[PDB]
Amino acid sequence: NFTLNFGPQHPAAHGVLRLVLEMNGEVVERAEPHIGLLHRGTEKLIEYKTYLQALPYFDRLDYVSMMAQEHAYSLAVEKLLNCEVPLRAQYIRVLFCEITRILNHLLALTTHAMDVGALTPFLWAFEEREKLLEFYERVSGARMHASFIRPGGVAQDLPLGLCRDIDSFTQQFASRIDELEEMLTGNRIWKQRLVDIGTVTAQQAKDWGFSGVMLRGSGVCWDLRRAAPYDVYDQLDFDVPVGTRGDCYDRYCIRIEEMRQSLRIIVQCLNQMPSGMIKADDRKLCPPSRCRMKLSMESLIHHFELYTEGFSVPASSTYTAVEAPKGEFGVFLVSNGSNRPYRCKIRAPGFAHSQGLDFMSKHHMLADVVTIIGTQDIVFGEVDR
Amino acid sequence: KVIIYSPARTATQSGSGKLGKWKINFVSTLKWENPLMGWTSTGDPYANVGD
Amino acid sequence: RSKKSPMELISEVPPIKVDGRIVACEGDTNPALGHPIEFICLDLNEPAICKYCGLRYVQDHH
Amino acid sequence: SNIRVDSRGPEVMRIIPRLNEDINEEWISDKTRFCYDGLKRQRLSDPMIRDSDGRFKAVSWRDALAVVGDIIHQVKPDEIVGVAGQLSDAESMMVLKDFVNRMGSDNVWCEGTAAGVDADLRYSYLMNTSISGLENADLFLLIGTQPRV
Amino acid sequence: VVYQGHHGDKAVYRANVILPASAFTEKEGTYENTEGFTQQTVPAVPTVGDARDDWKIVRALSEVSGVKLPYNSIEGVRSRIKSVAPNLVHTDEREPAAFGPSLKPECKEAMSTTPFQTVVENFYMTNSITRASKIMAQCSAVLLK
Amino acid sequence: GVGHLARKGTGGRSSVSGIVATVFGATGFLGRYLVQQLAKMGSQVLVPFRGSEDSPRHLKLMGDLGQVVPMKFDPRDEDSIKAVMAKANVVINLIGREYETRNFSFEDANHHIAEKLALVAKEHGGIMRYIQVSCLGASVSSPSRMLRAKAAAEEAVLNALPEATIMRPATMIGTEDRILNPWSMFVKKYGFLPLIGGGTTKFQPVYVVDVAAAIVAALKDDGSSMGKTYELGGPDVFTTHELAEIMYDMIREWPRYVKLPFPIAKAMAAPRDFMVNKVPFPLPSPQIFNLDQINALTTDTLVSDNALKFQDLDLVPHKLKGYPVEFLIQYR
Amino acid sequence: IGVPPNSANLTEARRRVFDFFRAACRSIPTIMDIYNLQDVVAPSQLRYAISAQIRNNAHITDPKVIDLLIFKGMEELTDIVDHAKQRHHIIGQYVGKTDFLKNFYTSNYF
Amino acid sequence: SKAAEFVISKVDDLMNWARTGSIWPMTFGLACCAVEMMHTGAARYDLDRFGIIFRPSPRQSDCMIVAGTLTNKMAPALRKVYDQMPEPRWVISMGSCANGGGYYHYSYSVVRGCDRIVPVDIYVPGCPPTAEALLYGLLQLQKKINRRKDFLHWWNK
Amino acid sequence: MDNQFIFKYSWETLPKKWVKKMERSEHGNRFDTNTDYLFQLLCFLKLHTYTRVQVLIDICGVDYPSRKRRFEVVYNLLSTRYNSRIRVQTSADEVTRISSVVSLFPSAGWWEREVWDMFGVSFINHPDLRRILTDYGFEGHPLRKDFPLSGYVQVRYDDPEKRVVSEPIEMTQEFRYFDFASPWE
Numbered sequence A: 001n002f003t004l005n006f007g008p009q010h011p012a013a014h015g016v017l018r019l020v021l022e023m024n025g026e027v028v029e030r031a032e033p034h035i036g037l038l039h040r041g042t043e044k045l046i047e048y049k050t051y052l053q054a055l056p057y058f059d060r061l062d063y064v065s066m067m068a069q070e071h072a073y074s075l076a077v078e079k080l081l082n083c084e085v086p087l088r089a090q091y092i093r094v095l096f097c098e099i100t101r102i103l104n105h106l107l108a109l110t111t112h113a114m115d116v117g118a119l120t121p122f123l124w125a126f127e128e129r130e131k132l133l134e135f136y137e138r139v140s141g142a143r144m145h146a147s148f149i150r151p152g153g154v155a156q157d158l159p160l161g162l163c164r165d166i167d168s169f170t171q172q173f174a175s176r177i178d179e180l181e182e183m184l185t186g187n188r189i190w191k192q193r194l195v196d197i198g199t200v201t202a203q204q205a206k207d208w209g210f211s212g213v214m215l216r217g218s219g220v221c222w223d224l225r226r227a228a229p230y231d232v233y234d235q236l237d238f239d240v241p242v243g244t245r246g247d248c249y250d251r252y253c254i255r256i257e258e259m260r261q262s263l264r265i266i267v268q269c270l271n272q273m274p275s276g277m278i279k280a281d282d283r284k285l286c287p288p289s290r291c292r293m294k295l296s297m298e299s300l301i302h303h304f305e306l307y308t309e310g311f312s313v314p315a316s317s318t319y320t321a322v323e324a325p326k327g328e329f330g331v332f333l334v335s336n337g338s339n340r341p342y343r344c345k346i347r348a349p350g351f352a353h354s355q356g357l358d359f360m361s362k363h364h365m366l367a368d369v370v371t372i373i374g375t376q377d378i379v380f381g382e383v384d385r
Numbered sequence B: 001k002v003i004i005y006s007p008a009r010t011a012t013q014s015g016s017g018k019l020g021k022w023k024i025n026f027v028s029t030l031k032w033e034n035p036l037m038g039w040t041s042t043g044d045p046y047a048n049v050g051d
Numbered sequence C: 001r002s003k004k005s006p007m008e009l010i011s012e013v014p015p016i017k018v019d020g021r022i023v024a025c026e027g028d029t030n031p032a033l034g035h036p037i038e039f040i041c042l043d044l045n046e047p048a049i050c051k052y053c054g055l056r057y058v059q060d061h062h
Numbered sequence D: 001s002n003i004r005v006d007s008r009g010p011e012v013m014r015i016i017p018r019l020n021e022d023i024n025e026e027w028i029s030d031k032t033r034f035c036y037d038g039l040k041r042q043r044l045s046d047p048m049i050r051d052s053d054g055r056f057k058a059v060s061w062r063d064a065l066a067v068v069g070d071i072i073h074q075v076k077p078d079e080i081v082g083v084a085g086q087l088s089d090a091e092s093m094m095v096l097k098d099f100v101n102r103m104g105s106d107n108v109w110c111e112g113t114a115a116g117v118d119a120d121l122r123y124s125y126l127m128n129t130s131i132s133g134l135e136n137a138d139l140f141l142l143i144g145t146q147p148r149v
Numbered sequence E: 001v002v003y004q005g006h007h008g009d010k011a012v013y014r015a016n017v018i019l020p021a022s023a024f025t026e027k028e029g030t031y032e033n034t035e036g037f038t039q040q041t042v043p044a045v046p047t048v049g050d051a052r053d054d055w056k057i058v059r060a061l062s063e064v065s066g067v068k069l070p071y072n073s074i075e076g077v078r079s080r081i082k083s084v085a086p087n088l089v090h091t092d093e094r095e096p097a098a099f100g101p102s103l104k105p106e107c108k109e110a111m112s113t114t115p116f117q118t119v120v121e122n123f124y125m126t127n128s129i130t131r132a133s134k135i136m137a138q139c140s141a142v143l144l145k
Numbered sequence F: 001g002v003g004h005l006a007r008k009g010t011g012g013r014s015s016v017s018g019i020v021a022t023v024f025g026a027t028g029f030l031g032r033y034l035v036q037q038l039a040k041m042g043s044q045v046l047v048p049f050r051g052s053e054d055s056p057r058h059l060k061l062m063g064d065l066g067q068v069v070p071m072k073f074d075p076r077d078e079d080s081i082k083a084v085m086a087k088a089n090v091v092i093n094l095i096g097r098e099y100e101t102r103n104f105s106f107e108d109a110n111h112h113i114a115e116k117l118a119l120v121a122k123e124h125g126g127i128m129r130y131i132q133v134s135c136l137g138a139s140v141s142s143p144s145r146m147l148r149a150k151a152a153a154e155e156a157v158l159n160a161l162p163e164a165t166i167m168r169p170a171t172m173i174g175t176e177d178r179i180l181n182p183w184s185m186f187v188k189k190y191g192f193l194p195l196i197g198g199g200t201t202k203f204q205p206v207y208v209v210d211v212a213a214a215i216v217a218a219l220k221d222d223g224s225s226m227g228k229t230y231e232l233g234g235p236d237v238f239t240t241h242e243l244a245e246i247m248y249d250m251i252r253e254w255p256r257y258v259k260l261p262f263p264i265a266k267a268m269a270a271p272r273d274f275m276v277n278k279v280p281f282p283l284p285s286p287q288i289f290n291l292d293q294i295n296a297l298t299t300d301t302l303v304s305d306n307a308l309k310f311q312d313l314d315l316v317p318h319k320l321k322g323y324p325v326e327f328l329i330q331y332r
Numbered sequence G: 001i002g003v004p005p006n007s008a009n010l011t012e013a014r015r016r017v018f019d020f021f022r023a024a025c026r027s028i029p030t031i032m033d034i035y036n037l038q039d040v041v042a043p044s045q046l047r048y049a050i051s052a053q054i055r056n057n058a059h060i061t062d063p064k065v066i067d068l069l070i071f072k073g074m075e076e077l078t079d080i081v082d083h084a085k086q087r088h089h090i091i092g093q094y095v096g097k098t099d100f101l102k103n104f105y106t107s108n109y110f
Numbered sequence H: 001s002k003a004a005e006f007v008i009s010k011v012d013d014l015m016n017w018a019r020t021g022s023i024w025p026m027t028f029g030l031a032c033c034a035v036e037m038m039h040t041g042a043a044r045y046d047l048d049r050f051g052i053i054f055r056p057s058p059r060q061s062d063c064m065i066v067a068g069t070l071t072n073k074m075a076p077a078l079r080k081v082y083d084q085m086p087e088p089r090w091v092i093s094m095g096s097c098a099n100g101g102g103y104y105h106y107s108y109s110v111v112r113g114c115d116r117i118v119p120v121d122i123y124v125p126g127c128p129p130t131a132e133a134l135l136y137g138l139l140q141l142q143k144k145i146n147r148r149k150d151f152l153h154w155w156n157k
Numbered sequence I: 001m002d003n004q005f006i007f008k009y010s011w012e013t014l015p016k017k018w019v020k021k022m023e024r025s026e027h028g029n030r031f032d033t034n035t036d037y038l039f040q041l042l043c044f045l046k047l048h049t050y051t052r053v054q055v056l057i058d059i060c061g062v063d064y065p066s067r068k069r070r071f072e073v074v075y076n077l078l079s080t081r082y083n084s085r086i087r088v089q090t091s092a093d094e095v096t097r098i099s100s101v102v103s104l105f106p107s108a109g110w111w112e113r114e115v116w117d118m119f120g121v122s123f124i125n126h127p128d129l130r131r132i133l134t135d136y137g138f139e140g141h142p143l144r145k146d147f148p149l150s151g152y153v154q155v156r157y158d159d160p161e162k163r164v165v166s167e168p169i170e171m172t173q174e175f176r177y178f179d180f181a182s183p184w185e
């Protein structure tokens, strides 16, 4: 069995993916992905920067679900700090996490389809994803990497003309999803290129740690935002799609239904949006209003000592876990009691999904491996931290 | 060659909250100025490990 | 203009006249867009320089 | 007195007293506190050799060291006097003493007030009573010392 | 004269060969107190220009002149001191004096008449470091008569 | 020549040295090694180029954020040449082509320009050092064409600046040399390796990094460098035949030769390819049949037994068998 | 295969060291064949280099430390043998008055 | 020279127009900047309008965009990719990680910019650069190409 | 199935001498064993009916350069059907072999290698233990508190030989460490 070197230097296979594998000529036996080409070194760099300076690390990891990533860090810091966040901040955080889920699902679906060969829905879905990156542009400073969510609440309040635009988008997003789905689900080629590909049993998914869509594509109803609801999700009404067969087609259907449920949750959060402040007030971990630190002494002191020293998290350690679009994303914070984290390991959902590729491509075609890569939605920012 | 010592309390402030901790002081005294922007350059990897 | 350095450009601005003993300087007309409020006790024969703004204040009469 | 030098990069920014109950007792003098400016002012950077015509140019380390090694033996084994400095550490003075003694000469002395003083008992030139021990005294008889300057 | 230091002050005006030397914030040497207490110095900052330690300079000059010395490192020269003054290598030790004014070369010689004279005139200009500073130059102009 | 090193820190790419050397004609073969050697020790190097703006592009990787700053200069113009030197203290000359174009004749290839830069450095009043480079074996009485003008330039430069070092490399060997790579390329095409010299032409090939080390060492050392003229040579003496075997054994091909006498090759080389006499300036460049080289291979290029040698500065030449010659694997 | 448990005593680690040296010598033609180096170096003094590097660390008595050096050496050997290490690095690692005056002339910090 | 100057100027103009009207950048995406780089080529900005069709292999592409951080392990691969390209080899350093260090700039396994390797012609700053910023960078590269007197230099020499 | 019930059950059901110490808090339930009864503890926690811990989330690692047992690897677990989390951790050492758990949870095969790479805690009966994250020619373990942030080697391209060669680190602007630590805390 001869060995050929994969590892294309372009994002047409997500880039940064060596993937040396064994070939019998047409059927692959063992595929060995060589991760580490994107080991930037965030985990070592976390310990050298305060709890505020370390927030933008989390946007870079899994750089398609930006606000779904810093949300886990914020929740971990809040748990370590016993900080209570106001209701409006919780609702807008849930809304923006759902927007991240929609963005990730769209990007994953179209990148996977373009890997298969269908290239026309790709540009349609990026046309629709323009409208949500514009929403990100509005609330925060930057389109993609938005440090909107902070440990206290969110960084800044929503602009006045935002909810109208969001609802106008949600009016037609369902029709756009239907248009994208009609080209793939009912198609013939899509079925023969996905059905009975990369089947994973529930026992295999549990053993290999496939929490996320891979776990739910095997019949396991394990949704972290329903099993362990963190923000205001009990109030919200949504369903958890669960597959029957562990093939790639049911994962695609599950992702489509997840986009539907995310749209439903966005509508619910838009309807049930309370007033009030956005940043917390119990502990002192939030900056004073810039119209307040310029005429008060204690407020200016707090601003100075927060933007230089930062808040000191009391010495403890914990493992938070949120439902990232990829799957379960968890941050293992260890606090020394000082203003810098002692150790912050990042549990990337894509790491386990990528290691579990070896048994998924067991006795498949070589071109049957790119579709397995696409269906598990691997970005290498999170895999190599 | 390293020096093991406990940093003393700073004179300017009366708090003793940074005391009782011991540090290893690698003598990384080799630093120069980049002749374009005045930045401080180093060639010793232990410039601030002990700090 | 850009030939004049800001140090030599602020000196030519005439000092403000204040009737009282202390004057509060907030930078710009809008308080939120200027420096933090600074109360300066102008009592000497020389103008009192605002440490943030550089503006000078002179007391004419009580 | 114990100090705490604070430096940013390659230059000393300020000098802060360090607590030492026996020697300085948390205080520090003005001369030792504001002398950090002299460490960056006019300083010797490279070896320099006077020229024949009176000019004073700079050379490499080997060249000046070669010149001094040329002139070291142009003089008699006697009269190779070497004067130590006020700030020179113990090692420098020790090596200077060894270098002078190993050439048939002995005229090494500390800078200033070292003409005919004998220092062999380690109490005729030292503060036998501890600096912290002066708090137990009852009378002082300062003899031409002025311990203020 | 072959001057070796880190400043000028009327010795450069007469020097024939000038060898730059390290300052006290950039060298590791043992200094002795008035009460016989010794303590070392930490190399805070790098040396300026092409300057070397004083002991390094004199050791290299000794080698080039052709006379051999049995030490080549800062540790070795410390062991040499241990045979001339072993208290100089005991950093944290409050050693007292084990003698007294009893034994001494008792010599009642001729007396004098000249009164005691001040040895320091300007407090802010004593050593080369304080003489070349700007803060001291303006400080010793309004703080004293 | 002292008081211009001004060392700052450890030997590194971002270190500092008091050298602002401008290497004229560094865009060729020797320049990409000399500039790298200069920048490795923190010296700032300026590369005045006259061709396209993309020719001194690979030289930006030598330094670190401003060590290498190329500028455009016009060889015909004079006062614009002063621009690329008004902030310099060291000047190195490498200009000179083995070819011959109409616009720049043999005299105005490595003599007139060298004299112009020497004179403008002399009148500059700040150029501390100068290292002009010529070929080994240049003389007034020689069948070689460019070597005669090159020798005239190397003797006329000293008049303007007496404290000028002259280096004489001999058939430099490297990854982009003009004497070994063309032979391999021709062998690949069809392959017969015409020996114009017909063997029995023993010279001293040298490897380029050794030459670059020689110049940087002449800059580093303080003493007998100004005025002195070195003659860099290889570890041993090589002829065109044994050099042919030591290049053929790596190409992994049968050594075949069409070794021919001198006059037929000279008649097929110089007059056949000499057509720069009318209308257009650019003409195709000679591959192996060079007008100067055919006349140059009639005499040995041994290093002078009484002049300066390559080991005078304590540099061991690279043994040109297994370590230097390794680029030929791209042909096999 | 799988990582063996740490050696109980030094005599059990000594045979492990000999086995590692044996494997390194067995695999030594492969490096010379796949990295295309024949004129620069002969295989015989590579034995000397490996022996020197394995005898320099011969004063360690702790069996765990010796086992860990064997482990790291195996990882380095597998990196070199496989197409992981890159050319001109194996050859980089493998194959007067006094020192004080030189160190004084070159720098202050030696 | 003036008689045969109009022809060479026209030839230079034609070559510059040909090279600016069809640039085929090679998508060497590495990190989050690759998202914005593929997002510029979407239906909203239409990077293809300027004849900026992408290429899958470095053999046909005449330009490459380094989008994303450049670790130590990918440096040799980047150098090999750059070497294989044909003679022109224009390089664009998209993002803030590629064009000099970046947000990390300090970790052990990061090359401090793609200028230690693969010499760069245009630096596009941003983290991540806006699609219009990448478009402006490409326009600046096109302006750079228009200054190449390819035939005039080879005819003067 | 909640924190307290699991605490009672694992206090009663678990054989002694396994858990060196244990904690119960809202942050998380801990079971600190003694670096030898790890495979046994995980096997019991995986197969028992009242504690059906099936999925191993991640294998952490904390470097404490102040205790005799320098390192401390942390095993995060999760019971899907009981909807509960157990965090088992040990104490390791820089020269010591701690047992592997790839047999129970196959997903650990890569976190095992990553923990070896970052810190240097080797493992037994593990098929590979090869570096997974750092460079092929990388030396030292970076997540140790000893390793400098900038590292030991730099990477650059030199023209004399057409390849990318490593070199000693030499930075243009040093990493400015701001010491914000203050007393009264």
Ligand SMILES: NC(=O)C1=CN([C@@H]2O[C@H](COP(=O)(O)OP(=O)(O)OC[C@H]3O[C@@H](n4cnc5c(N)ncnc54)[C@H](OP(=O)(O)O)[C@@H]3O)[C@@H](O)[C@H]2O)C=CC1
Binding pocket: F024, F025, F026, F027, F028, F029, F030, F031, F049, F050, F051, F052, F055, F075, F094, F095, F096, F097, F104, F108, F109, F110, F113, F133, F134, F135, F136, F150, F169, F170, F171, F172, F173, F177, F178
């Ligand atoms: N190294 C060797 O193998 C040998 C070297 N030598 C001597 O060493 C010198 C350098 O060797 P080498 O590096 O091969 O030379 P180059 O191959 O570098 O050519 C010299 C460079 O100078 C520039 N140049 C040439 N003519 C002119 C001109 N008229 N006006 C302005 N710039 C010009 C060119 O740059 P562009 O093309 O970009 O204009 C050319 O690349 C040679 O000139 C020769 O005298 C002697 C024998 C053999």
Ligand SMILES: CCCCCCCCCCCC(=O)SCCNC(=O)CCNC(=O)[C@H](O)C(C)(C)COP(=O)(O)O
Binding pocket: G014, G017, G024, G028, G031, G050, G053, G054, G055, G057, G058, G059, G060, G066, G069, G070, G072, G073, G074, G076, G077, G080
């Ligand atoms: C190209 C190949 C690539 C890999 C090359 C190798 C790279 C790693 C090399 C390993 C580096 C090491 O230090 S790992 C090996 C280090 N371990 C030891 O040296 C054991 C301690 N020494 C002893 O036991 C004895 O003194 C002994 C000398 C053995 C004999 O003496 P006896 O008989 O009385 O016992």
Ligand code: SF4
Binding pocket: A060, H031, H032, H033, H067, H068, H069, H095, H096, H097, H098, H102, H103, H126, H127, H128
């Ligand atoms: S510049 Fe910003 S977005 Fe681009 S790779 Fe670097 S960190 Fe990621």
Ligand SMILES: [Zn+2]
Binding pocket: C025, C026, C027, C035, C038, C050, C051, C052, C053, C054, C055
């Ligand atoms: Zn004001």
